[PDB]
Design a protein around this ligand. Structure first.
Ligand SMILES: C[C@]12CCC(=O)C=C1CC[C@@H]1[C@@H]2CC[C@]2(C)C(=O)CC[C@@H]12
Ligand SMILES: C[C@]12CCC(=O)C=C1CC[C@@H]1[C@@H]2CC[C@]2(C)C(=O)CC[C@@H]12
Ligand SMILES: [Cl-]
Ligand SMILES: [Cl-]
Ligand SMILES: [Mg+2]
Lengths: 126, 126
């Protein structure tokens, strides 16, 4: 699996791709049989096309920005967790959302599972 | 309480950090379900049950000179789970360790599972 150092780099790359809104590059980071649970607690999404649709729905508008708010924490079994903040516009109101993603990678360095922790308690109107 | 709401998760997880910071081992153990599991660091084999969990905390915190503080908000779901970023300070050099814990709570408000994400890449010495 990817080493702890490689996990930190992969997860930081993911945030860069969200920040610039490169949906095709994000989708290509996922394994073909990956699952996304975002927000955690909702049913998982499976399949490349469904994941692409999810990111298009979320990042389509183009006014989404994202940045890490602390270091990526990485294990020795190909997993990591990271804290970040998303900025977006919601019916005129600029907003921010604090999120933690947990990811498990496969032997090819592709995301096998993603779980995103957030709810309305993590939402701020600016 | 019952299965904790998102707001209750934020309060429970913040209280956990307080208890780590002060080093109240018995109060920590009583936040866990009787048959809880801990994976710390994630990737190592789980421990099972309050007696094993107490031994773990006694070893890690019993020497004193461990402090802990949240470095950002607790992220909480609507299914009794949350994730939080924090930093542990300890001491031959003074170091810091950046960690994310993920917790799932039971229907009584006790921690059923805890997974801690960190490795040597998250340790800073001076
Ligand atoms: C998909 C996403 C970014 C990438 C990531 O890894 C985690 C999240 C979760 C919150 C999403 C966000 C994108 C923007 C969304 C859709 C909103 O406008 C409300 C919820 C929020
Ligand atoms: C148990 C613990 C605190 C509570 C928590 O929630 C997560 C951790 C994981 C890292 C532990 C730390 C306690 C202090 C430890 C034992 C060290 O001196 C090196 C590793 C570190
Ligand atoms: Cl942090
Ligand atoms: Cl944060
Ligand atoms: Mg029980």
């Amino acid at each position: 699996l990817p080493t702890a150092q490689e996990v930190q780099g992969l997860m930081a790359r993911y945030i860069e791709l969200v920040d610039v809104g490169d949906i095709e590059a994000i989708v290509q980071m996922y394994a073909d049989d990956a699952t996304v649970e975002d927000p955690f607690g909702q049913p998982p999404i499976h399949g490349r096309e469904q994941i692409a649709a999810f990111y298009r729905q979320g990042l389509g508008g183009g006014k989404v920005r994202a940045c890490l708010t602390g270091p990526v924490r990485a294990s020795h079994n190909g997993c990591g967790a990271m804290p970040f903040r998303v900025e977006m516009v919601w019916n005129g109101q600029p907003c921010a959302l604090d999120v933690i993603d947990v990811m498990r990678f496969d032997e090819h360095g592709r995301i096998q599972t993603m779980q995103a922790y957030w709810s309305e308690v993590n939402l701020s109107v600016r």
